[PDB]
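---------- Forwarded message ----------

FYI, see the endonuclease V record below. Original note from H. follows.
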Amino acid sequence: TRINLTLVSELADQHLMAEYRELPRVFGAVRKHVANGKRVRDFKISPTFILGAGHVTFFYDKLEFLRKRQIELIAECLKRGFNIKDTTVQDISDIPQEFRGDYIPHEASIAISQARLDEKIAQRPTWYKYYGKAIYA
């Protein structure tokens, strides 16, 4: 599961579709943990954004950030003419407030996220498209 920090209008089609599919998984994971009696204090949340080990957990107390980003992802999918089936933002008001924080990444954090996306495309640029156009080489 990978959450990106870059503007959704700048994502390659493949990356946009992947994040649309994967971001909501975090909500379900928190629900599962809440049902198991866990609290935010039970998690080791990094103080700064990271990729890899601890990436998903970093967002456990930042669900409002994710909710707002899911709004943007859906809108970008529709803008590109993609046929997505769920066009509604998930209601997360059932999750305890301590997990529903917001977040504003610094440009240095965004640069880490951007570098990972760049690196993936560079591997085989023909696998990526933007509005269906092969602009990556």
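H. also flagged this: Residues 63-79 form the longest helix (17 residues).
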